[PDB]
Structures are given as C-alpha cells and as structure tokens.
C-alpha cells in the first residue's frame, strides 16, 4: 500500500506544518482558461480557471531508492493537512466533478507538495455607467486565507508577474479585454488580525463604432431633416405642418426603440442628454412656423418675399447645434 | 492528537452547558459584505455576509502553560455542541465551500468559543408601489434560534449598533442604499413558547431625474404641441385635422413604450395617472376644432376673423393644465 | 447520554407503533409563513409553511422524578419511526438547512411526540383564462402518506378548522387572496388501496380598475374618435381621407401594445373579442366615405348639403356601440 | 429485527434471480400525474410520472403463520438486487425526497416484490414548424434497462394497454392533448447486443381559430382597405397618394408585432407566405396611381371620365386575391 | 460473493497497471444521443452521450469453468483502479442518476475491462458574426487524462475514424450541422509535461432565405418606392412632401424591428451595412426635391414642364443603387 510509505497515523495532520514557530510560505500559480460570462444589470463576471500550491512538509518524507515521485487524487486530501483558500467577495462557486473530483496531489522524496485544482467562479464588479457608451471598467479577482494570520501561514505569488498565464482565445462578445497585471495587499480584520491578499487585475472596453452609427446618426439626420421647412413657401401651410408633426412623431420612435436595447440601467447616461437635446431641436423648429404662420395672417387681416423669422433661423439653428456638439465632445471626449 | 486535549468523549454534547439551571448568552456580530440582486415583481433580495458567535463552555477548557488557542475546521463542529440559528422569512440559503466548507472554531483555554462562518440568503420583503416613482421601500434581516425558548438561551447583539459593520463598496444598481441599524424583539408561538429575535434594517429610494426626464418630459411637451391649432387658420381643414389626429397617435406609442419599461406590476400607480389625464386633454383638443368646422359651415350655408371657441380655448386650456400640476404635485410631493 | 434513556437497541423501529392491530392516529397542523412566486404559463405556484405531526409511542417512554421533557435535533430522526408524508400533485420541494437542518424532535416522558419541519413546495394548479380579465382561480395543496394505507395510519386535522394559520402580511404583487379553509377526502389507488387526503384551499382575484383604464377606455376614446368625420365638409376630400387611415393605424398600434404586455396565453379570450369589435367599427367607418365620395362624383359628372348617408350614419353608429356594450357586459358581468 | 428474517447476509445480491439460466420476467406499469412544461425552442417536454416494477425471487422468501407482507423504505435497496431502469433520449431527471425518500418495497410470503417510485423527467422531442399554425406533433418517452440484454432480463408491460393510467386533469396551456397508447420494439448495440425497449406515445394540436382571428384577419382587412382608392377621383392627389403610403406603414407594423410574438424558428413557415403575400399586393396599388398620374400629366401637357387603368384593377385585383386564397387553403388545408 | 472471486484485498489500487514499466493504452470510444442547446450570446453550447473506456489489468483476472464475464454496477469503482478523464474548456456537467447511476463494468476472464457512462456536458466554442447572417461556425469537444503524462498512459482512438457515431435524428431548431469528424494532438503544460487530446469537430450553418425574405426584401421595397415620387408633378408639393417623410418614418421602423429580433452582439455585421445604406438612399431622395422647390419658387418671383433635377435624379439613383449591390454581393459572396 503506497499509503503506508507515508506513515499516515504516526503524525496529527490537524496542526500545521512547523507549528509553534515561524510562518510556512505558500506559494500559488494561476493559469485562466476561460471567461464565461458578464452580468451588467446585477454586477458581476464569471470565470474558470487552474489554482496550484506550493509548499513542503517534513512529515510526508518517504525513502527511495531512485528520484521518482508519488500521484494521488482527491482521496488522499482528507488525511493530511492542505492550505484553505477561498474567493474574497464571490457569490458562487464550484469544484469540477466528471468523470471524477479534478484534484491532484504529488509528493516529492524529500517532502515537497504540488496541489492542484480546477474551479469556477462568479465575483462582483461595482460599474459606473455614467460615460455609456464610452465607459472603461475595471474588475479584480480576489485570493486569501481563511483561518489563518500571516503570523501562521505566508502567502505569496510563487514567480511575481510570471505566475499568471491566460489562454490565447480568451475572449468576450460585446467586450474588449485587456491588460492582465497581479497585486497583493495587506487586510486588517478587527476579529482575528491582519491578512494576506492576492489580486488578478484587467480592464474591459466597448466598441465606440457600433454605438455612434446605430444611435448618434439618425438623430442628427433627423435634425438636419427638421432644417428643410425654413426653405418650403410660407404659403403651403398643408406642406409644413405635416412634416413638422411627423419629423417629432419620427424621432420620439427612434428614442423609444434606443431605449429599448440598452442594459435596462434607471440613471442618466450621456447618450440621454445627446437624444433629448436633439429631440428640443425638433420641437422648437414647429414653434417657429406658427408664429410665422399667426403674423402673415394678422398682416393680411390688417391690410384688407421671405418673411425675416424664416431668414434668422436658416442661420441661427445650424450654429447653435455646431456650438453645442464642440462643447457635448469636448467634455465627453 | 489535538482532539484528545478536549475530553471529547468524556461528555454528552447532545445538551447544552448549563443544563438544569439558567439560560447560556449567546453574542452575536455580522459583517455585510455585498447586496447581490433585488427582484420587484417577486419582491425580495439577496444578501452575503460574515456570522459571528460567542459564548463559553466549561467541559472544553484545557491545560496549557502559555496562553496561546486551538483552531479547528468544520469537521470538529459534528462532535460538540453549537447554536442553531436560522433565518425567518428566508425563501433559500447556503453556506459556500470552496475550496473547503468556510467555516471555523477557535477555543481559548478557558473553554471561551468564537464560531464564525460565510452564507448567502434570499429574503422577502414587501413592497408598495403606489407612489412610483416616488416610493420609499423598508426591508429587513432577521435571526432566530429553532429549538431553544428564552429559558434556556438568551440572545442578544454583543457590542450594541457596533455590532454591524458594512463593506464600504455596497451598492445596488438602480437604487441608493441608507440607514443600516439593528433592533431586538420578542416573539410569541403558540406551540412552544417565547423567543429572542434580531433585526438589521435598511432603506432604498430611487434616482427621480432619470424618471422625470424620461416619463414627464415628453408628455408634457406633446399636451403643449396640442395648444399650436388654437392658431391656425380655421379655414385650412387639410392642416387642422391631421395634425390633430398625429398628436393622438404620438402620445398613445409614448404611453406603450413607457409601460413596456416598467416592472410588470399591475394596479395603478400615480405616472399612470399623469399620462392618462394628458391623453384626455389631447383628445379633447381634437373635438374643439370639430366643433368649430361644424358651426361654420353652418353659418355659410344659412347666409348663401377669429371664431369665439379659439379664442376661449387658447386661455382656458393652459390655465386648467397649471392647475391640475398644482393639485398633483401638492399631492404626491 | 441521553439515548440511552430511550432504549434505542431494545426495538425494532422498522415497524410502526401498534403493528398487527388498529391503525395509528396521526394528527397535522400547518403554519403557512409566505406565499412566493406563481407563473401563469406554467400553471405553478410555491409557499413555505411549517409542518408539525403528533402521535404516540409507548417505546419511547422513560422514567423521570419530574415533569420536563427532553428535545432533540434531526440526526435522531434516522432511530426511532416516524410517518412518511409526501404533497400530491408537486414539482419540486426541498427542506431548510442553514445553519442546520430546521428540524427537531421533543418526547414527553410518557412516550407523546411532536415532530416540526420547515420546508418549500411548488405545486401545480390548472387555470382557466376564458374570461381575462374578470377570472378568478381556486388552488389547492394536498398532503398524503405514501406507504401506509388507511388500516394502517389514521390521518387527520388535529383541531379541525382551527389547524391552519396564516401570516398577517402574505401577499402577491399581480393578485388579492382571499378565504382560507381545510377539507379531507379519501382516494383509491388500485395497486394499494384507500388512502386519506388532505386539502388546503385558496381564491385568487385581480384589479379590475387598472385593466378597465388601461385597455377599455382608449379603445372606446378612438371609437368615438372616428365619428368626428361624419360631420366633417364633404368637399374636404384632403382631410377625410388621411384621418380614417390614421384612425386605423392607431388602433392597431394600440392593439399590438396589449397583446405584448398579457401572459402569453394562445386562445381566446374576453378583452380581445372587445378588441377586434372596435377595430371592426373604425373600418367600417372609412368604407362609409369611400361609397360617399364616389356618389357625389358621379352626380356631378352626370349634371354636367348634407349627403342623406351621413345623416343616417351619424345616428347609427352609436347606438350599434350602444347596444354591442349593452350585450357584452350582460354576458361577461 | 425485520430485516432478519430476510437472511440478507446469507446470499450474493449482486447476481440476479435465476442467474446462469433463463432469463428473469420484469413487468411495469406506469402512472402519469402531470405535464410540467413544454419549449418549442429547446424541443423538449418535462413529467411526473410513478413507475412501478414486478418481479419474484425466491431468496426473499420467509415463513409465516399467516398471509401478511413486510413493507419497507428506500434503506433497504441498497441491500438487495433490484432492476436498473433508465429514461432514453432524456436530458435531465431526479427523484422526489421530501420528506424523505419517495421509495418503497414490499415483499410477500413467496418472494414477490413491487417496486414503486416518483420520478420527473425532461425529454428531448423534435419538432417540424413548416404547416404553422396547423402543425401536428407527435412525441414520445421510452424506459430501457441499462446492463441487462433480452439474455438476462426480459422486459414487458404487465396488462397490455391496460398498464397505463392517466390524470383525468392533465393539460397544456397553449396545447391539446390527444391519444396516449403504449408500444415496445428491439433495438440493437454494437457494444453489447440486442435490448427490450418500451414506448408512451401522445399527440399535440393547436387552437386554430384564435391564430385566425390574431393573425390572418387583419392582413385581409388591410388588402381590402388598399382597394378603396380605385374608387376615389383621379384628379385628388394629395388624398390619393397618402392613403398608399399609410397602408403600406399599417401593413409593416403589423408584420412586425406577429413576427415578435411567435416562437423564434428561424426558417419559412405557411404564415409568413400569407403575410408578406398581402404585402406584394398592397405595393401594387401604390404603383397603379402612380403609373396613372403620370399619364394624365402627359395627356393634359400634350392637349395645351375614369382611366381605362382604374375600370381595369377594380375588376383585377380581387379576383387574384381570391384565386391565392384558393390555392393556399387547398395545399395547406 | 463474486467480489472475492477478484482478489480485491491483494492488490493495491492507487497505482496504474504496469506501474514502473511501459505506459497502459486506453482505447475511447463515443456515441452522441442528442444536441440540447445552443446559446449565441455566451458562445456555448450542449450535448449528451456515452463514453467508453478499453484497457486490460491482469490483477482482476478469474478463474473459469467457461467463457462467461461478470458485469457490475458503479459501486465497484471506487475499489479499484479507472482512468480519469475530464473535457477540456468546459463550463460544467454531470453523470446521470435515474433510476441509479447510469455506470457499469463488466470484466472478461483474462482481465480486459469495458467502462461505460452516460453523460452531459456544456463546452465553449468562440464564434465570429461579422458575416452574418452568412456566417459559418466550427465548433469542437476535447477530451483529456488530468494526472497522467503520456509516459504513463497512451490514451488513443480505439478504431480511428469508425469510433465515433451519431444519433439518426439530431438537429437544431435555428442550425444546420454537418461534417462530424475526430482528430488527435498533443498538448504541453509547463507544470507536468505532454499529454494526449482527442477532438470531435463539426460545423454549422444557417437557412439563408428566411433571412432573405425578412430582412433584404422589405428594404429594397422602401427604396424602389421613394423613387415614385420623381415622376409625380413638381407642382403638387402637399402630395411631394408628406411622401418622403412617411417614406423614412417606414424605414426607420422597420430597422428598428429588425433590431429587436437578431442575438443581442454589439458590433458592426454585413445586415447592418446594406441597412444603413438604404436609409442613406431614402434620405436623400428627399434632399432631392427640397432643391427643386426652392429653385421653381426663386425663378417664379424672379419673373413677376419637367425640371432638369428631376430627369437626371430618374436614371441616377437606380444606377447608383443597382452597381452597391454589384460591390456588394461581390464582397460578401
Ligand atoms: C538531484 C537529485 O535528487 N538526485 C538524485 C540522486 O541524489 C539519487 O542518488 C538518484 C537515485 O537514482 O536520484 C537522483
Ligand atoms: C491574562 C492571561 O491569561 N495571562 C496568562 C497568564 O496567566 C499565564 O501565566 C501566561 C503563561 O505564559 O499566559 C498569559
Ligand atoms: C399532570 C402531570 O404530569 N403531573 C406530574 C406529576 O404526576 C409528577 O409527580 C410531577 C413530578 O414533579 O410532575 C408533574
Ligand atoms: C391463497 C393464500 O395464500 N392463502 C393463505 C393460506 O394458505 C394460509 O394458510 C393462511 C394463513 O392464515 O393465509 C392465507
Ligand atoms: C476463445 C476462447 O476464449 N475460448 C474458450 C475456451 O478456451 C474454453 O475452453 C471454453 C470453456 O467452455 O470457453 C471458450
Ligand atoms: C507586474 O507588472 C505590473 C505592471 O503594471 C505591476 O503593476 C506589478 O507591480 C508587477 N508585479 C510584480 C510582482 O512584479
Ligand atoms: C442603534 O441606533 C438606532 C438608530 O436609529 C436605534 O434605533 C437603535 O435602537 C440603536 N440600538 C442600540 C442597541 O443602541
Ligand atoms: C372549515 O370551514 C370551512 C368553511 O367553508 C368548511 O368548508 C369546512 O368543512 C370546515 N372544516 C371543518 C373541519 O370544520
Ligand atoms: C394498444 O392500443 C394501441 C391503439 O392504437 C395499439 O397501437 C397498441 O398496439 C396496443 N397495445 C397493446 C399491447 O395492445
Ligand atoms: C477521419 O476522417 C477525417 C476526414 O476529414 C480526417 O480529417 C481524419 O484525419 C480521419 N481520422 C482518422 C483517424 O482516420
Ligand atoms: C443629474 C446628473 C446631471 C445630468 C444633467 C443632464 C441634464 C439634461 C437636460 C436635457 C434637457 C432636454
Ligand atoms: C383605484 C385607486 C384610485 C386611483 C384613481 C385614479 C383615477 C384615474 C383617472 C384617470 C382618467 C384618465
Ligand atoms: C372560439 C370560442 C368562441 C369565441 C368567439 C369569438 C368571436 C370573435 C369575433 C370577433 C370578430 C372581429
Ligand atoms: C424555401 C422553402 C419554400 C418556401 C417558398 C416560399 C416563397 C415565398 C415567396 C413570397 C414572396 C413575397
Ligand atoms: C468598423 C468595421 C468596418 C465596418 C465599416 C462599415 C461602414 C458602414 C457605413 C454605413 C454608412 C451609412
Ligand atoms: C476562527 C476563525 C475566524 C476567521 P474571521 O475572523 O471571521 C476572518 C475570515 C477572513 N479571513
Ligand atoms: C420541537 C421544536 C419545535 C419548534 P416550533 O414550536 O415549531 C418554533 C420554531 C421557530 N422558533
Ligand atoms: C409499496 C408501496 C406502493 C405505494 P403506491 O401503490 O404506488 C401508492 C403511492 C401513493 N399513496
Ligand atoms: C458494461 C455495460 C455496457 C452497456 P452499453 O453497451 O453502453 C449499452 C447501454 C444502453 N442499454
Ligand atoms: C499533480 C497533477 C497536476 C496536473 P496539472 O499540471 O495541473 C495538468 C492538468 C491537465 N492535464
Ligand atoms: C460635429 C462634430 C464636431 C465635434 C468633433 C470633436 C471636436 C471636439
Ligand atoms: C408645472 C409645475 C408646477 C408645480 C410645481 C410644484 C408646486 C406644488
Ligand atoms: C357603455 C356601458 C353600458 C353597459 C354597462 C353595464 C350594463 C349591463
Ligand atoms: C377566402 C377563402 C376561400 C378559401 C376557402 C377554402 C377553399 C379551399
Ligand atoms: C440586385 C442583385 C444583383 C447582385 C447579384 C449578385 C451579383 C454578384
Ligand atoms: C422658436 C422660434 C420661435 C420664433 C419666434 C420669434
Ligand atoms: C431664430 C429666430 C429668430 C427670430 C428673428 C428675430
Ligand atoms: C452632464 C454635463 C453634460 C453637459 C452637456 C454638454
Ligand atoms: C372640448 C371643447 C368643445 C368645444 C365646444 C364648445
Ligand atoms: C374652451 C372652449 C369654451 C367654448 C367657448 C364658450
Ligand atoms: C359601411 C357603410 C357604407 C355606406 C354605404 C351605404
Ligand atoms: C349607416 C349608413 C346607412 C346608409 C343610409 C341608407
Ligand atoms: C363568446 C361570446 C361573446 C359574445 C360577444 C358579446
Ligand atoms: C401594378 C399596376 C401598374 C399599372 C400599369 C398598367
Ligand atoms: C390591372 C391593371 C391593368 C391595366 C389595364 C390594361
Ligand atoms: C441629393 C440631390 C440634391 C439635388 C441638388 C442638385
Ligand atoms: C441626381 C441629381 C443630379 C442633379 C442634376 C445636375
Ligand atoms: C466592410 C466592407 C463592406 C463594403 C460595403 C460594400
Ligand atoms: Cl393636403
Ligand atoms: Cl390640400
């Protein structure tokens, strides 16, 4: 029995390795297979991945007669001691099953250990959509220590920056990601002591070209349709009501399908106050044809070539929704 | 073995300490580390936190000669007594185990014991949704003991209101979050008797701009659009009536499009109210000018300048509109 | 060690209490803590409730100087006998476990039990949707033994009406409920024979206002709205004719917009016969100044005041209204 | 004990009764209580059903001085050899353990055993969309043993069609449910031989009338509508040309609200062949005036009653139509 | 007992067969039942099936009277030693349980083994959509040992291209799949070394005409109508202007439509482009006749036919549209 080349009953693998004195170092690998999926309404991501520890233990030293190391799977984990980390700040996760427990042990003549898992896990990423459809976000997944201090138990990345690796396909449907980066950090909990902390940092960004020619283009073509009443006969009243009435019914159809394909997110966004700025546009260009239309009517009345209004306007409106898209872009970028 | 410093054997952990004479106290403390969903339409939420407990037991005191503790895992929790605590009004709940069951004791020498473990609950909270978009709501957490009666244990918060503590990064997506305290109570069941309950309270309000501009905004600008054929010419019948009737069809896509993006919550709110009465003022304008034409022709063919109703209508319209604004916002605040 | 009071080893707990002789009567009460969720497409709803059972044991009985009983937690539950109940006509159900298993066992000295479990059901009720949305639903959950018929368990209400409780504040957000009682009747199964069944009844009803005003009263408002053109010059060929087809256009977007905020739910129902009545009406209305126009065409023709088809239709339109009105809400209450 | 006089440690249950001889008889009965849901999207459909087994073995035999039997739960499976049944073509299933296991075994005298348990599945079922709405779908579900081939195991049904039993209650919301029977067939493995394999068979139908009046009604109103203008003076174009362009609007926004409330199968259902039918000849309408405004221009120009065009098409265009309407309903019933 | 006819106690099971020597071949083969789902927005997709497993192990021989082999239930598995498969790039799975679990072994006289489950498994696939809807997919199911380096077991494909078959009727409701086929390749991890892959490939394809039908059509539909109004008078501009404007309001909604029903992915595809294009057109067949209006109404103040914009505009847009489509038809095949 290979279990007996470990004297498995002869020591209290309840206790860790070198207690009473200083703290045994762990060190941790971590290779990413895949991102699963992105919840923008609930906050959170969904990834699967490798996790690997490192460390050694003088109790599980066994004689050979060559160089050659020992396998074990999953069974062997409930009779010794192993280190528990856990996901700081997750909502679910899981160990994978089939067509047995994903879990390994290797042990090393002389006492060294390799343990190694595979595992998938939901965390939470706070968002701010205040910059929509140009926002950047940033998310972290999170590594520690249950139960013990770094007075106990010492944890590091095992190469620093050459710990992580991330597989060449990764990718996400409406997301760009980007660079990849490890931290760590000391934690302070006021019930038991301070603790050490491991981060996974990476950066997600839209792509701005869908965005611009699905929503920022009809808008402004539908102004720029609303200008085309200053140039028609101030006489044919059956020609500019109707186009005026149904250039608003058009664009407040285009705002209502807008809305109804974005992430259903209940604060004001900056492709808002683009949409309805415009929509003001088009409802202060039917205002103008009825006072033009009210005081031909009054001087005809009275008495029994362009009119002036129509010529300020042919010039006014164009310049102030000019002036208005150099500051809107300027300050959003 | 460490398990043999408790005389685990030597006692029966199935009653608790104290047996046979007053209640043991039991202190509690919780840190809140994220709010994960919220569901209007099955009104309820979820929530991840960190439970903490503390309370002494004589028949686990061992000798040492220093001061230092035993810490164990989960698998120690089946062999000696624990408080059963449980959460009332819960619809599901679980305790995360990756990559172990998170769950820990730690026992001083004196036979002091803290019990700390990390759990995910759903819980039902009953909402109103009369004033919406104006609404306040008020949840709460509650904690209770299953078996055991005030006169054998006593529960109580450990340290008061500083006995809760919340992550400073909580935040819901479509809500703000205020007010966390705790409260006690004593509860009645007639099968079995008095117990102890715990209470964590918080409250939600929504962002009103986002509301007021997309909802109020339109409606209000369509019921001012309806106002412009009080100044047409009456004798252009082809651009007094479709104008009329293209406003009917601008506000009924407006009201579908609103209530699509609501939640499906089906009695009357005070927006529908708004949105109801501005579609009863455009449909009456459409019937003034009916009557107007009418009386005309009339007039014409009998005898083969403004007409009175306009000039009635262009100062009574608005006037009946500020004030019904008045009463509403007096009302609904 | 307390089960050694009861002589767990002495007995065979295979078998029931009284075994070769009279059926054992078991008595049940239920405290119904909350209603959940319900899905009209599916026919389901689901509810958490506590179930407790009482009968009596004389194995279990144990000597004592006092009166006091003693109480136990669910791990005794696999020793002793207890009843096997089971809810008919069900889904899906689990039992509670956080931060145990919300279960427990109290035993007096003279052998009486009472056994109390937390637990959540779905369960399945068949709806009729003919008369949406004036319908009102009756649901039921049922409770039986799986293995003991009725000469060998005894199944009953234990105090009768007064066994059911309910919470104050139990509610659903799309429903009212109304008129809680109990029922038993007994049920055949021709592989086993008679069992005894028991039934917990409920009535469901809807706001009837919210649907009046959102789907009656704009449909009646664009009926009433294509009668405007029946006093309209018939010389205004340009403004009868776009009003009519924009009459229409508008109520088949309103219909669209009340099919997709309904359960989907494909057969025929109350409020789409009232639909496609008042679109029939507005159809008809423009088949009117078609046979106008041309008429008035032709005698003019021929040759080189009101027309007598709008003074008929002026009066016969609403009283069809009047009297189709009159009809269906005799018929549909 | 009871399981004593059952000698269980007297035999090896993990050979079958009458091993090394003939094959074992295995009967079955089944009972349907529900059906859960159905996903036309998916193709498959979920049930709860009880399966109950009969078969005898002479090792369970025991003395007794009457005719009593011994009634036992699910504990006492793992002790004894029992039948491995399993669902074919299935995606998922589970067994029902509230609130406890819902498992028992009875045994008589002589050795017989009935084996009884509750059970829901989900099974795959596929589907052909091409004659919707008048689409017929025949599904099935099918229960194999997984070890055992026609050599070892003989598997039957117990009473003919007389085995299967239905809820009386039984529905589906959005179907009916016809014609349940029972078949069984051989079936061959490449791997391991030839296996008795049984069959439950039932139909599904759709409520045609509420797809007729939903679907097929508007689009004719709408083509009957576009014949009007035939009818209406040539010499009123601004009433001519925007009733065209406004009955073209009203036909695509219908097709748009039935294209979003049927299931999403992206390939050519009858349906769409009407619709877009009716489409094609509203489009023809509108180039019919255009083609006899343009000729009336040219006559006048060249110069300085009805068109022959107009008599023609109010002849033409029904006629058509309704030969359509004769050969769709002749090939699609 | 026929588990001491295997020397079960005699050996150790927690090494490989041949441990020290030469590395075990293991022979796979699969059969696939069904494909369940697919899921364009997370890019995965599901499938059930049987694995097979061939090795030999002289430890489990027997002694025989005949040529019979025992067959065994999944109990046995954890007494001896299996192979430890697991899918690469998957995102979860299980084995299936009902009635019991779905495993077996049956065992020759000589030691050959066959190893048989049943199993579903959900898996990754990248997929590309910027040719849609005239994309084509390639998606794939890998298969690899977790602890065992090609020099301790050769795992390989038991009789090449023969040993994969699949089920008569598998389908996808919105795909067409073909061209199933297995490879092999081998794969290097940095922490262990080489290990083998199998692969099972296939590929997927949509039904182009329905596209066709509901996106491509309409469009060109609206296009060809705006160019009506270039042979309608110039003189009636009441009839000229509210055509165009309806003109672009249809379009917009029908883009809008389109919109709501394709898979939520936010980025540029081909539909799209031809979409936007038409608009374009639209647009500025109405810039078209803004131009001649103001021209006519300049040259008649000035003083106190067909206009040239007009006969070119005829013969300019089509050509102009017609050599887009050329380019392309010609780009996206
Ligand atoms: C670096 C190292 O561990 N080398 C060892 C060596 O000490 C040992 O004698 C040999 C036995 O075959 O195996 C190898
Ligand atoms: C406050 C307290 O517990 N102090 C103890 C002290 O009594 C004990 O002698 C010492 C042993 O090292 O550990 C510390
Ligand atoms: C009604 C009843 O059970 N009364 C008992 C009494 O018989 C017993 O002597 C006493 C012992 O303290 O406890 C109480
Ligand atoms: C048909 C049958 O099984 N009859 C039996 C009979 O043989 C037996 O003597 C009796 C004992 O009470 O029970 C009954
Ligand atoms: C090819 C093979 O395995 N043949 C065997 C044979 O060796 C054996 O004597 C016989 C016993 O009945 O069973 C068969
Ligand atoms: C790894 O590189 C990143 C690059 O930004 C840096 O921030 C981080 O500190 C580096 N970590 C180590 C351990 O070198
Ligand atoms: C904590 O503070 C809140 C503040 O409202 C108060 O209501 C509550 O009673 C306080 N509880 C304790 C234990 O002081
Ligand atoms: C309880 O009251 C209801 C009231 O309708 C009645 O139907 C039922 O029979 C009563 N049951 C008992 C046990 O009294
Ligand atoms: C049961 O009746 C059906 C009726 O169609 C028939 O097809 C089937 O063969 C019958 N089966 C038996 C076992 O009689
Ligand atoms: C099986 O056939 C496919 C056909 O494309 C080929 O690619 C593959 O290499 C073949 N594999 C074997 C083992 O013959
Ligand atoms: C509430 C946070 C600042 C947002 C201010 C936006 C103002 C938008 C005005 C648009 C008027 C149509
Ligand atoms: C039913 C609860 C009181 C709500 C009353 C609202 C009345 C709304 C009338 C709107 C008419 C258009
Ligand atoms: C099919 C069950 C009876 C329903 C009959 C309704 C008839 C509705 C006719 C509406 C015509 C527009
Ligand atoms: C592709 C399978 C045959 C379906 C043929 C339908 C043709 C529809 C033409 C409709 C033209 C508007
Ligand atoms: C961004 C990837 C290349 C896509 C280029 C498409 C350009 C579309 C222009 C449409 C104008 C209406
Ligand atoms: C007895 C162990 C208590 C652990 P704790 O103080 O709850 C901190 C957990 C996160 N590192
Ligand atoms: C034997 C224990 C019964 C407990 P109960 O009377 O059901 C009250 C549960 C909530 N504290
Ligand atoms: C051996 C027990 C069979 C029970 P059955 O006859 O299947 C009836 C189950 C519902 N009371
Ligand atoms: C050792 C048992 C193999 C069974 P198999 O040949 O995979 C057929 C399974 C379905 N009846
Ligand atoms: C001790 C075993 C480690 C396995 P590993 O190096 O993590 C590679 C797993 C995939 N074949
Ligand atoms: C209309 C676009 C002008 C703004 C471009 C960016 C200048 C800051
Ligand atoms: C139109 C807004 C007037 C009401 C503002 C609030 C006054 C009570
Ligand atoms: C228009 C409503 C009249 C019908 C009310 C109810 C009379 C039966
Ligand atoms: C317009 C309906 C005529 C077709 C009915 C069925 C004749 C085959
Ligand atoms: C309008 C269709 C012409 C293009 C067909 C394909 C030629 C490359
Ligand atoms: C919004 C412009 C109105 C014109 C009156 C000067
Ligand atoms: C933009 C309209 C200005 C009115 C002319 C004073
Ligand atoms: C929220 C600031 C935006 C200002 C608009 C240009
Ligand atoms: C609603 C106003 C009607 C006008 C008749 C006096
Ligand atoms: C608001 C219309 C009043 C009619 C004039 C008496
Ligand atoms: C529907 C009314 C038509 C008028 C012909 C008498
Ligand atoms: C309702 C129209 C009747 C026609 C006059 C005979
Ligand atoms: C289904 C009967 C309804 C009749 C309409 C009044
Ligand atoms: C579609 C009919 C066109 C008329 C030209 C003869
Ligand atoms: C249907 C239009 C036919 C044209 C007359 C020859
Ligand atoms: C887009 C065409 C405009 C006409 C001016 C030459
Ligand atoms: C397409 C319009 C061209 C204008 C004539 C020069
Ligand atoms: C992305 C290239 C498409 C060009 C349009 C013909
Ligand atoms: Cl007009
Ligand atoms: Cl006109």
Not at 257 to 262: F, H, I, K, Q, R
Request: aromatic share 16%; net charge neutral.
């Amino acid at each position: 029995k290979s279990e007996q080349l470990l004297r498995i009953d002869d020591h209290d693998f309840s206790m860790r390795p070198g207690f009473g004195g200083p703290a045994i170092p762990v060190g941790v690998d971590v290779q990413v297979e895949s991102l699963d999926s992105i919840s923008e309404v609930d906050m959170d991501f969904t990834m699967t991945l490798y996790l690997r520890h490192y460390w050694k233990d003088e109790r599980l030293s066994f004689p050979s007669t060559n160089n050659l190391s020992m396998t074990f799977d999953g069974r062997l984990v409930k009779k010794i001691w192993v280190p528990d980390m856990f996901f700081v700040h997750s909502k679910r996760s899981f160990i994978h099953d089939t067509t047995t427990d994903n879990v390994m042990l290797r042990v090393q003549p002389d006492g060294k250990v390799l343990y190694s898992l595979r595992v998938t896990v939901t965390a939470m990423c706070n968002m701010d959509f205040s910059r929509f459809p140009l926002d950047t976000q940033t998310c972290s997944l999170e590594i520690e220590s249950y139960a013990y201090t770094e007075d106990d138990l010492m944890l590091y990345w095992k190469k620093g920056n050459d710990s992580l690796k991330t597989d060449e396909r990764i990718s996400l449907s409406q997301f760009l990601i980007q660079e990849f980066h490890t931290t760590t950090k000391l934690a302070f909990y006021s019930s038991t002591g301070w603790y050490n902390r491991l981060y996974i940092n990476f950066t997600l960004r839209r792509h701005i070209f869908f965005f611009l020619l699905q929503t920022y283009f009809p808008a402004t073509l539908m102004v720029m349709l609303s200008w085309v009443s200053f140039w028609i006969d101030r006489r044919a009243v059956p020609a500019r009501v109707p186009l005026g009435i149904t250039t608003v019914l058009t664009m407040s159809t285009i705002i209502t399908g807008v809305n109804a394909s974005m992430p259903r997110v209940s604060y004001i966004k900056a492709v808002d106050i683009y949409l309805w700025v415009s929509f003001v546009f088009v409802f202060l260009s039917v205002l103008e044809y009825a006072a033009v239309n009210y005081l031909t009517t009054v001087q005809e009345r009275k008495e029994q070539d362009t009119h002036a209004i129509d010529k300020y306007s042919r010039i006014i409106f164009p310049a102030a929704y000019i002036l208005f898209n150099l500051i809107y872009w300027s300050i959003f970028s």
